Amino acid sequence: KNSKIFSPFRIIGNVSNGVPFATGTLGSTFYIVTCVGKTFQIYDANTLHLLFVSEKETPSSIVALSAHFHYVYAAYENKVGIYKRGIEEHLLELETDANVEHLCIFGDYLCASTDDNSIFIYKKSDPQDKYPSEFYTKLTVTEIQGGEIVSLQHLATYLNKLTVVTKSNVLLFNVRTGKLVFTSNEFPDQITTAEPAPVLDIIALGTVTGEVIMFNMRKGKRIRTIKIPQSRISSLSFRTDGSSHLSVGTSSGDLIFYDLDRRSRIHVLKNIHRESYGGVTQATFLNGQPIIVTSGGDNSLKEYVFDPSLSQGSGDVVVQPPRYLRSRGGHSQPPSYIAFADSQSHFMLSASKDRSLWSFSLRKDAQSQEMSQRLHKKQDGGRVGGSTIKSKFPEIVALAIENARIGEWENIITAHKDEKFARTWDMRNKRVGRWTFDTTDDGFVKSVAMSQCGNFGFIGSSNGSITIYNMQSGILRKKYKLHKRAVTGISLDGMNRKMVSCGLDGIVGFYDFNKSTLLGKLKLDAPITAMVYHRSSDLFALALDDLSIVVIDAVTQRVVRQLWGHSNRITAFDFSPEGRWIVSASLDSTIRTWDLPTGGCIDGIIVDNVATNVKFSPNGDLLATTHVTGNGICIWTNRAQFKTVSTRTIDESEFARMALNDIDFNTYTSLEQIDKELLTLSIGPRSKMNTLLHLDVIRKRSKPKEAPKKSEKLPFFLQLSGEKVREGIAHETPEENKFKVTGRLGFESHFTKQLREGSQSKDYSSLLATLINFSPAAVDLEIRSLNSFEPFDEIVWFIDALTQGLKSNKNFELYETFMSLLFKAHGDVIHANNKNQDIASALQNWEDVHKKEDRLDDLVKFCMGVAAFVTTA
Amino acid sequence: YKLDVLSSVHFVPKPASTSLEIRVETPTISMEDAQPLYMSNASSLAPQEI
Amino acid sequence: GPYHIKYAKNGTHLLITGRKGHVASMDWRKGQLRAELFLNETCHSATYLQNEQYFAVAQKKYTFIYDHEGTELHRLKQHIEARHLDFLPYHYLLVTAGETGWLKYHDVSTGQLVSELRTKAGPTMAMAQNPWNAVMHLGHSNGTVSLWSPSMPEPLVKLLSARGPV
Amino acid sequence: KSDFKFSNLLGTVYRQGNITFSDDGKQLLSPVGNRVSVFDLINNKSFTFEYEHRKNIAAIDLNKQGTLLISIDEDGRAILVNFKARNVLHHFNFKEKCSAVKFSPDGRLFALASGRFLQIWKTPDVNKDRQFAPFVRHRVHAGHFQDITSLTWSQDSRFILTTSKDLSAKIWSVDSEEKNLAATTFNGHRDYVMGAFFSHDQEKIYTVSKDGAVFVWEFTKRKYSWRITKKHFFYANQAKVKCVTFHPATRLLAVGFTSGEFRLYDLPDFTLIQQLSMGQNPVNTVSVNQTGEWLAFGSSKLGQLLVYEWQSESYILKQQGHFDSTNSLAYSPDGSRVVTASEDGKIKVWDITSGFCLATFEEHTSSVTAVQFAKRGQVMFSSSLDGTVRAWDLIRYRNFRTFTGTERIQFNCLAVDPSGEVVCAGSLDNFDIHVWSVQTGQLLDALSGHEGPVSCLSFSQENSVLASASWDKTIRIWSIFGRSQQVEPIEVYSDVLALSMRPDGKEVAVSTLKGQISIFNIEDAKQVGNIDCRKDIISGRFNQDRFTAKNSERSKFFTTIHYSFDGMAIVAGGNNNSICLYDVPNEVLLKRFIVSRNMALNGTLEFLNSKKMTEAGSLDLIDDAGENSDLEDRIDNSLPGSQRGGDLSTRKMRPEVRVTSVQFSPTANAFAAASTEGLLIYSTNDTILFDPFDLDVDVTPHSTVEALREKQFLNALVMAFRLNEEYLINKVYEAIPIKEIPLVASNIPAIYLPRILKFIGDFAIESQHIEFNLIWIKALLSASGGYINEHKYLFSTAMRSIQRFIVRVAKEVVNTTTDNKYTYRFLVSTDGSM
RNA sequence: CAUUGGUGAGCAGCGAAGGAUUUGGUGGAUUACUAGCUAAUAGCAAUCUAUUUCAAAGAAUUCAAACUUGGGGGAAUGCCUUGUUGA
């Protein structure tokens, strides 16, 4: 279930799942906490901008949300988590299997009610502690005491009392002492909602049959009764702006406002939220404000505002009806299709069964917007035919988008269910286009495609004809008729030369788009279901009905790779941007990544819900998928973008049960030396050879033109007097006798000791190794410090060291450079004593090896003579 | 300078004149900018000049 | 923003100058806008002259005198980089100080620079007129307060009233 | 083919912000305007990150482990980029103008100086996968009354010294339990506190102010408290301290002054180690190596970057770039070098790999308009608005000749004969094409016939004809060579802005003011193709524009075009935010590249934010110079009507995104585009794409290795090419024994011959197997020499790469080998005595 | 005869509880989403201000300071510099 290439990132397009949202105040500002499946999101009330998201997904779905100042409490299963800025600060685990249902926090007490009518009280260990952690006591409400707990509320100015509201009646529990202070009279109708009023001792109770009660706890008596026959109260809220208003939300999707002072109805907002998804699940007046925030199960959050009265006198009577202020939303049902709008990962296009198309922004949620379905006026001038009652376009089965001509004309084509024409949209305007493309053969639209240039749109009909329209003018230009069954895929190469089609009849047609000719036809064993064309590589994969993905090269019209392993139908698949991977999803609840070069499955996942779509970002950073459940889009991060991934084939049997290293990582490190006989340069920069030979002249250029000014009184040993790293040759310490010019024993340099050791051992491999590691300045200093006085042992030894190096044929271009520096620094000494046998013998041996390395000159001279001739004449 | 910038450098070039320059023999590496590289190693004076 | 405000001597008019260059003159009681300039420039401070009819604005480098309706009357080329403005109502002198460390007195009636004095203490950080005797108090970065008159090239008094800029 | 990606940015080494040394000290990170460039001084390699801010970078920093880099623009927008993978981890907006950012020496925490608040965050773990909110806040400190100038971490990652504009330096403790240890404020500075540091023992605190005073603080009895025991002063007559840095180990204090000169001091003795001047412009940033031996300085005005080795008094690096000045570019024939001409009058030679300016030329008085290389490559020619065309000899860096018209005309375009014996230049005020003889310097003739200014010129590399285009809506082909001179005019629908000549010399392409690229047949003088480009061009609305970008006709045409050396592609650019790469035979757009994403540049955006618009006008158009504290920033030297050819201070308007010239690399699948920010180079080097050629089911990476083990070298090599995997080609290439090379080379199919030659050239230039590669090249040329001759233009780029390898590295080795042979013989044969 | 001139009188065709044009206001975007205030290692968010004061530290002969002027000629009286007189 864990992928080695992909990891979940977040969900897109979901604002609320229907659980009542929580409102908390930080200073003068307000924020709203909404539940999204197993995670909650925090919005700023002023702008509805996303601020925080829960760091980790809870093991179980969240049931309750309560927020007080910085801290947010989220209840799931039998555990209550405490979050600050979306990061968990402490997890409260109850000691009973009964799941938490309701949650209340007043002062240092946290009250959690389980579904078995048991109330757990947690207290702060210290009065100054930010949140309660310590377990205080347990209070249980028995059936004789009352019915099932409806909600836990705390009224202001009540010392250590919790007002437990049950279906039968209301109860007053003293949390400190754990005793039942007061029991209210039984109510004929089932209670569904409770809300503390801004007045003292009064809590508003909402019944199941459209009755709202202003129950007074101090007197224990009814005060008022509002009646809403044939309705169910889902939320209640009071206006604290100085106006005695009461907003009653209903499961029908209506929000009613009452004026308590005048005993009248101000206004009713009809169908603000869908009845099918629970209507008004939560509707709360912002404290001290005329703004009311409403939510529902339809994945939407809205805000309404009361404007000031237009009458200079009697403003209380002339109440402006509430006005829509701002809202956030998404699909009400799972998206059916998705697509990346642009090369970068800014925007995604989404379509859902709710007949609405959305443009979702990954970089910021506020940028997400719904594309309008308002139709343009017809060019001919005739009246457009349609029902006066406005309805959204049918569900979108397919979509094709290009950005070559964005802002110039239509750049999206969409196919709709049971519809004989395709509609166009404009991404720049975010509105439906002015063209409609018809199949012209009495068949439904099954495939839509666009050319890279953005000028042509291709429509595939269920009767087998491919019609080609022009996006700018919407004029039918060409019609191809090869397939006799439905065309399930159309694609055109980037060059606009070769066009490929596939259909349920199983044939793959290759057309020359410009010449309009049938280049070839290829028959496959099973009907083809879908196509994805990779324009850069000229490869396209086909999802066959035999549970295989067949990769075909359009240039040669042959099958190159065939992929097996899926146990059921392949819902969707996509190419990686580099053209090296295919990620496919199937009905068997798995997502597999396939490596085309080796033609094997390298990664496997098991999704709880079948993934209906899969899409790579053109960058390759992100992978977006949609599932049969959930209104949002799951975004995955591509781990391969930050490290190499092994291409070893996944184990099939272990995967089913759950339901050469250089080649594995697609790399190769060049050998140190292909053969001993072959000359090989050093493993390093090629400027080292040039830096060594011309060191002095390069440094003269480096010196500043004007001498720097310095203080006359300067420490003589400043460079050495350093607090403590410098690894230069100057900063060398001796390692542990008659005076010797080269170096006295116990006072000898590391290099000279290695040189003397090599001379006795008759091998300078250790010396040659350290020479290569020396810096260019260090190399010059050592050679120039070589002993130049009789019997000339060190010079002879150095020549023997270099002569050995040339035999190895490795790093020879440094050894030539070292010998060049030796003559430069000790040429006169060698010249004056050329007749000395030791120098003469050592020099002669060097020439014997050096003479052999003249074949390289012949190779260089040949290639210049030919390469100059071949390129010229 | 001010007039040339004001006219967007659409001025009329100055009359041509001849002047003498002295070139001193130096290694070609010195004339280059300071970096860990050199492009040419020749001398600044040709054999005819010497 | 930010906005520097200067009321008229009789309190009937309000002159406001935003930093980004939004200058407005208005009668705040009756809410009548006498003038409004949208100079695309950095304005530091503004002041009313003898009455609401004329006002001065210290812009990026020069001080400008304006009319009641917002018509520019003069560009004070002599006052450079003025950051503070003050008007001596009984003497009809306009006073400026800024990054130049130069205190300049300008006669609005005759339009002649009465005197320009060198403070020699760098940029001027603060300024306030003594309404009783019309002596200008300037604070400097060295933390001293100097009292000035147009007729003396040297300060009348020097007071050390801070350890840092005033 | 058409898979190009931004690789590095030449022409600029430093724009603004703080330059930072890598922890190992072998890499220098320099912000170049909107991006970050990394220079590897030891290996002589450079690269610029692909991620792009929306405004200029203000602060950057690389953690000690060398894994994470954080870069912050002028608005507080921050990007966390994985240094090793060169990929962006997260984008963070701090919602305020962050002045400095610094990783703790432990690496766990990094601190932000955002206005008057010091923000300490926890570093995201590089190994962990990306999450929604990788950063975790640690603490925010609010003690300063004004903006924080800088901050310094203690060597133990426990204390932070913050210096602000409050004339105060303040110390904090990272751990709350240790707040009592460091809760002090350091006062007594007359001006802004530029920097505060700890000593190596951490018992001494040094603070430096803008006025030029260094205070030495110690914990001493008057019962124990921090006191200023000693005070030192930089007696700069008028220069103000601009940037300060301190190395506790070596006790080195490097101070950069506004006069453009920096001093190195030894604390606490206050001994002046050195004093040097980089110029007259302020020293904006100074940084110290970890060892303390290299000091990096940067000046924003001229874009200078100086790495100084104060120990040896030597310049490791001394570079100066161009901003909004590069008028043209030219590749060397081997492609190793790229030359640029600037409005300053200076011609600079840049090395593609290292990214530094090898040489500079300053003969030209006015802006240099064009630069072009001879076919041979040793000689270079340039033209300038001063009215002279100058020939440059690269081997001795001498202007060996200079050409000038008799009427003193400004020259805007240039063309050089393939033989290098004739030079032609054109003008925008003469209507004639002047011709000079290279050997003599005499004006051979003036070509007449154009009724408008000549916009461009080009010689045919083979036919040696001259093609000229003008605003006269016509193109003329001059047969100047030969006993008879002929001219063939071809009419065009609109003004011709650019012209490119086919390498074959058989066709010429012209970009017109209509946004059209029309290809003509030179011999037949008839049109053979046309490419529409007005729709492809992306042009942005300027802040000052009162008309939409869609209706704007400012630049919907390409002012420069160039063929690919194969002859099948055209790369085009203009005064617009797009570089478009077209395919000639099929007349389609292969790809489009966005030149810049910097909102500082004027032409980047097609749509501007309506919030900026007000009743006065655009909020951007308001000049905020007066708010600046320093006088030099407040001074306005702008001339009223200047558009071009002066310093940026003169224009008074934002720089405009535009491409002055474009060219293809002679030796690689890359192209370079000169623009305002610098010389953008796009290359296909990475080759992560899977672009197979002629696969079958039998071909697989496993199967190729099986062929190698069975010793079927030819089949293994061919199957590797059909996969087209670089690693698999390299594996097979090195596994073929030397005896079998001649057999394999003679038997490679002709289709794969261009591919092997391309691989060898790219591989050989940086590989260590000089002899093995030379054996392969010898086998290939001998086996298929005739085939390469028949198709020169298919193999042109591959052949140039091989020649570069044989000339630039192979010849250098034998040159060092051969001189030892002669130096050897002289020492032994000769008689040395007395 | 032609109007690619204006103004009207009507068809064919398009055509689901109407259609077309213009316009005021507000909301969301137009840069990439880590929450409000303060005296900020924490408080507040109903504020305290009835501990908010003490202690410590903190003052360059830089005791310098128009880098800021449209050109030509002067400048009585001013202002700057230099000397000088008498205290």
Three-state secondary-structure class, residue A697: helix
Q: DSSP labels for C64-95? A: EEE-TTS-EEEEEEEEESEEEEEEETTTTEEE
How deeply is C23 buried, as exposed, middle or buried, from its count of CB atoms within 10 A (0-12, 13-18, 19+)? buried
Q: How many other C-beta atoms lie within 10 A of the C-beta of residue D637?
A: 11
Whole-number Cα distances in Å, D9 to A231, A253, A697, D326: 69, 59, 29, 13
D635 CB closer than 7 A to any strand E atom: yes
Residue A836 CA to its chain's centroid (Å): 76
A 635-664 → D contacts, CB under 8 A? 637, 639, 641-643, 660, 662-663
Question: Residue A542 to residues A491, A533, A548, A620: CA-CA distances in angstroms?
Answer: 12, 9, 8, 21
Name the minimum distance, in Å, from the CA of B14 to any CA of chain D: 7
Q: What secondary structure letter does DSSP report for A169? A: -
B39 touching A (Cβ < 8 Å): no
- How many angstroms separate the Cα of D384 from the Cα of each of B13, D335, D414, D466, D658? 10, 24, 10, 21, 20
Rounded to the nearest 5°, which phi and psi values hold at D634?
Answer: -75, -30
Question: CA A189 → CA A192, A212, A250, distances in Å?
Answer: 9, 11, 16
Rounded to whole angstroms, what are the CA distances from D560 to A432, A607, D602, D663, D821? 38, 53, 20, 9, 51
Which residues are CB-contacts of C40 (< 8 A; sequence separation ≥ 6)? C21, D616, D617, D621, D622, D623
Read off the DSSP letter of residue D548.
-
The order of strands in the sheet holding A622-627 is A6-12, A633-638, A622-627, A611-616
Query: Which of these, A576, A654, A579, lies nearest to A2 by C-alpha position?
Result: A654
Provide the shortest C-alpha distance from residue A551 to chain D (in Å): 10
A381 touches strand E (CB under 7 A): yes
Burial class (CB in 10 A: 0-12, 13-18, 19+), C45: buried
Chain E: positions less than 7 Å from a protein CB are 13-21, 26-46, 56-60, 62-70, 78-80
Q: Which two tokens stand for residue D508?
A: 């010429």
Q: Do D627 and C19 touch (CB under 8 A)?
A: yes
Partners of A494 on chain D (C-beta within 8 Å) are 588, 590
Count Cβ neighbours within 10 Å for each residue of A744-777 and write b for 16 or more, e otherwise.
eeeebbebbebbbebbeeeebeebbeebbebebb
Rounded Cα distance between D39 and D31, Å, is: 11
Q: With 0-12 CB in 10 A as exposed, 13-18 as middle and 19+ as buried, what is D461?
A: middle
Contact A168, A159 (CB under 8 A): no
Asked if residues D101 and D112 have their Cβ atoms less than 8 Å apart, the reply is: yes
Which residues of chain B lie closer than 8 angstroms to A776, CB-CB? none
Q: Which residue has the tokens 């074959």?
A: D504
C-alpha distances in Å from residue D761, one per residue of A333, A683, D84, D755, D769: 57, 18, 27, 10, 12
And the tokens for A453?
């240039």
What are the Cα distances from residue A388, in Å, to A58, A374, A385? 47, 13, 9
Chains D and A touch (3+ CB pairs under 8 A): yes
Dist. CA A517–CA A560, nearest whole Å? 24
DSSP A98-143: SPEEEEEEETTEEEEEETTSEEEEEE-SSTT-SS--EEEEEEE--T
Residue D691 identity: D
Q: How was this structure determined?
A: cryo-EM
C-alpha torsion sign, points A661, A664, A667, A673: positive
Please provide residue D627's backbone torsions phi and psi, each rounded to the nearest 5 degrees: -70, -25
Dihedral sign for Cα atoms in the order D275, D277, D282, D288: negative
C55 with C9: CB under 8 angstroms? no
| Residue D465, token pair as written in the block | 């004809």
If phi > 0 it is left, if psi is from -120 to 50 it is alpha, else beta; for residue A497 that is alpha
Residue D537 CA to residue D606 CA, distance in Å, equals 11
Alpha carbons within 13 A on the beta-carbon side of D628 = 12
Structure tokens at A528: 């083809």
> What are the phi and psi torsion angles at A307 (to 5°)?
-75, 160
Do the Cβ atoms of A615 and A634 come closer than 8 Å?
no
- Output the CA–CA distances (angstroms, integers) from residue D64 to A518, A813, D250, in the order listed: 62, 35, 19
Cα(A174)–Cα(D775) distance, rounded to whole angstroms? 95
| Interatomic separation, CA of residue C114 and C1' of nucleotide E70, rounded (Å) | 22
Whether a cis peptide bond, with omega within 30° of 0, leads into A791 is yes
- Confirm whether any atom of chain E, the nucleic acid strand, is less than 7 Å from CB of D128: no
Go through chain C and list every residue after which a break occurs, taking a C to next N gap over 2.5 angstroms, comma-separated. Answer: none
Nearest residue by alpha-carbon distance to C1' of E40: D142
Q: Do D781 and A714 touch (CB under 8 A)?
A: no
CB–CB of A687 and B37 under 8 A?
A: yes
Give the angle B37-B39-B43 at the CA atoms, nearest 5°. Answer: 120
Residue D625 contacts strand E, CB under 7 A: no
Q: Which residues contact D560 (CB under 8 A, 6 or more apart)?
A: D498, D511, D572, D573, D574, D659, D660, D661, D662
**Strands of the A507-512 sheet, one edge to the other:** A487-492, A498-503, A507-512, A517-523
Distance to chain D for C32, nearest Cα, Å: 19
Chain position carrying tokens 């050989």: D764
Which tokens sit at A277? Answer: 């998804």
| Total residues found in chain B within this entry | 50
Q: Of D675, D656, D453, D677, which Cα lies nearest the Cα of D554?
A: D656
Give the span between the Cα atoms of C10 and C2, in whole angstroms.
25
Question: Residues 91-150, chain A: which have Cβ under 7 A from strand E?
Answer: 128
* D213 C-beta less than 7 Å away from strand E: yes
Alpha-carbon gap, residue D308 to D316, rounded angstroms: 6
A556 burial level (CB within 10 Å; 0-12, 13-18, 19+): middle
Instruction: Write the CA distances from A677 to A847, C20, C136, D537, integer angstroms.
Output: 18, 77, 94, 57
> How far, in Å, CA of A352 to CA of A394, rounded?
10
Distance A383 CA to E10 C1' (A): 20
Tokens of A759: 């001379």
Q: Find out whether the peptide bond into C2 is cis, omega within 30 degrees of 0.
A: yes
Position A29, amino acid: T
Strand partners, D350: D338, D357
Using a 7 Å CB cutoff, list residues 78-117 of D near strand E: 88, 90-93, 95, 117
Going across the sheet that includes A100-106, the strands are A100-106, A109-114, A118-123, A134-140
What angle in degrees, to the nearest 10, is found between the helix axes of A776-784 and A812-832?
Answer: 30
Chain A residues 225 to 284 whose Cβ lies within 7 Å of strand E are none
Q: What whole-number distance in Å separates Cα of residue D717 and Cα of residue D756?
A: 10
Q: Is the CB of D544 under 7 A from strand E?
A: no
3-state helix, strand, coil in chain C (%, to 5): 0, 50, 50
Question: Taking CB atoms and an 8 Å limit, are B34 and A690 in contact across chains?
Answer: no
Residues 627-686 of D with CB under 8 A from C: 627, 631, 634
- Give the Cα separation of D4 and D685 in Å (integer): 8
Cβ neighbour number for residue D268 with a 10 Å cutoff: 17
How far apart are alpha carbons A518 and A56 in whole angstroms?
55
Placement of tokens 């970068």 in the chain: A344
Supply D662's token pair: 């474009």
**Would you call D477 helix, strand, or coil by DSSP?**
strand
Find the DSSP H helices in A703-787: 750-761, 765-773, 776-784
Do residues D169 and D176 make contact, with C-beta atoms less than 8 angstroms apart?
A: no
Experimental resolution (Å): 3.2
| A590 bridge partner residues | A586, A606
Residues on chain C touching D146 (C-beta within 8 angstroms): none
The residues pairing with C80 across neighbouring beta strands, listed in sequence order, are: C62
Contact residues, chain B, for D366 at CB < 8 Å: 4, 9, 13
Residues sharing a CB contact under 8 Å with residue A497, sequence separation 6 or more, in sequence order: A512, A513, A514, D586
- Order of strands, edge to edge, in the sheet holding D68-73? D57-62, D68-73, D77-82, D87-93
Nearest Cα residue to A164 out of A211, A104, A77, A88: A104
Return the residue in B26, B29, B44 with the most chain A beta carbons within 10 A, the one to mutate for interface testing. B29
Per-residue tokens: A747 = 């006072």
Q: What are the distances in angstroms from CA A517 to CA A464, A481, A499, A535, D535?
A: 17, 11, 10, 20, 29
Question: Distance (Å) from CA A60 to C1' E44?
Answer: 36
What is the amino acid identity at position B36? P
Using an 8 Å CB-CB cutoff, list chain A residues near B32: 701
CA dihedral sign of residues D647, D648, D652, D655: positive
- What is the CB neighbour count within 10 angstroms for residue D551? 8
C-alpha distances in angstroms, A10 versus A14, A362, C135?
10, 10, 69
Give the separation between CA D29 and CA D51, rounded to whole angstroms. Answer: 15
> How far apart, in whole angstroms, are the C-alpha atoms of residue A429 and residue A582?
33
**Which among A700, A701, A820 is the top mutation candidate for probing chain B, defined by the most B β-carbons within 10 Å of its own β-carbon?**
A701
Closest CA to the C1' of E18: that residue is: A388
Handedness of CA C143, C149, C151, C157 (dihedral sign): negative
In this structure, is the CB of residue C84 within 7 Å of any atom belonging to strand E? no
CA distance, residue D247 to nearest chain A CA (Å):
10
Contact D436, D478 (CB under 8 A): no
Contact C23, C17 (CB under 8 A): yes
Q: Which of residues 101-120 of C touch strand E (CB under 7 A)?
A: 101-102, 115-116, 118, 120
Name the closest nucleotide to C144, judged by C1' and CA: E59
Q: At what angle do helices D753-766 and D770-790 cross, to 10 degrees?
A: 150
Is the Cβ of A317 closer than 8 Å to some Cβ of chain B?
no
Is residue D759 within 8 Å of D733, Cβ to Cβ?
yes
Length of chain C: 166
- Asked if A302 contacts A293 with a C-beta cutoff of 8 angstroms, the reply is yes
Long-range contact pairs involving D809-815 (C-beta distance under 8 Å, separation at least 24): D809/A686, D809/D765, D809/D770, D810/A856, D810/A860, D810/A863, D810/D770, D810/D774, D811/A860, D811/A864, D812/A689, D812/A690, D813/A681, D813/A689, D813/A813, D813/A816, D813/A856, D813/D770, D814/A856, D814/A857, D814/A860
Task: List A227's β-bridge partners, or say none.
Answer: A211
User: How far: A204 CA to E33 C1' (Å)?
Assistant: 37
